[PDB]
Design a protein around this ligand. Structure first.
Ligand SMILES: [Cl-]
Ligand SMILES: [Cl-]
Ligand SMILES: [Cl-]
Ligand SMILES: [Cl-]
Lengths: 108, 108, 108
């Protein structure tokens, strides 16, 4: 009698337990799949970041080259300018020579 | 009798349950370690992305500067060209003066 | 008697089991929250990487344009230089004409 009441109490507990276990298992299966998906996406990200770092490095290399190019062009300009000064000097000298020639002719 | 048969049925259930519980615990321990690893890798990624964003910002700053440099060089050129025009003008004027001088000498 | 001893053994097992189940449930709840947080951070990362890739693409476009600009400026310079040569030639020719004029005047 009293033993049968105890056994009833025990059978119900076990029922409720088995049910918990099933639901726990479902929950765990769900999380497993979520985690794998996350582990997959992280790999994707890392791939995309390594890709980008390389592009950054290439761009850096291109910025350097360009800066050097610009410097050389800035210099070439200065050489050109220095050359123009010399030309202007010659031209003023020539203007003067022409004037002086004109004066000799005018006197004679 | 019948009670002993019930108790047998109960003991087996419990056995099978305890086994489930152990295997569930293993599964959960595994996922925990996977998750920590993922949480670690994500931090790595974020660090690498913040690193890259900064490089991007620095490059942007360098592109601006370079563009400004190029503009100034494009301008300096235009100044140089305008100066050359003036030189060519003077040179044609001089050529003309020389010709006219030659004519005076030829007449006399 | 012996049955009551068995039932005692069974009741304790169930107690210990229920406790395991609770603690398992807590553990699982914890991991769930960790995973969601990770899934959230990964999305953040992906957003930040797509953002950066676009910036990289824009920078590439700007490096191309700048390189083309620099090339044109390097060319314009060469045109300018070729023009200067011609000017210097004219100037030497003029110097010579002036000298020869001077000689005619000196003779007469
Ligand atoms: Cl995760
Ligand atoms: Cl990530
Ligand atoms: Cl330039
Ligand atoms: Cl990135």
């Amino acid at each position: 009698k009293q033993i049968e009441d105890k056994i009833e109490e025990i059978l119900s507990k076990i029922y409720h337990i088995e049910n918990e276990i099933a639901r726990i298992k479902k929950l765990i299966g769900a999380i497993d799949g979520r985690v794998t998906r996350n582990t997959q996406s992280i790999e994707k990200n890392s791939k995309a970041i390594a890709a980008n770092t390389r592009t950054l490095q290439q761009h850096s290399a291109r910025l350097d080259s360009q800066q050097r190019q610009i410097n050389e062009n800035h210099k070439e300009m200065k050489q050109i300018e220095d050359k123009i000064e010399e030309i202007l000097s010659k031209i003023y000298h020539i203007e003067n020579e022409i004037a002086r020639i004109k004066k000799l002719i005018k006197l004679h």
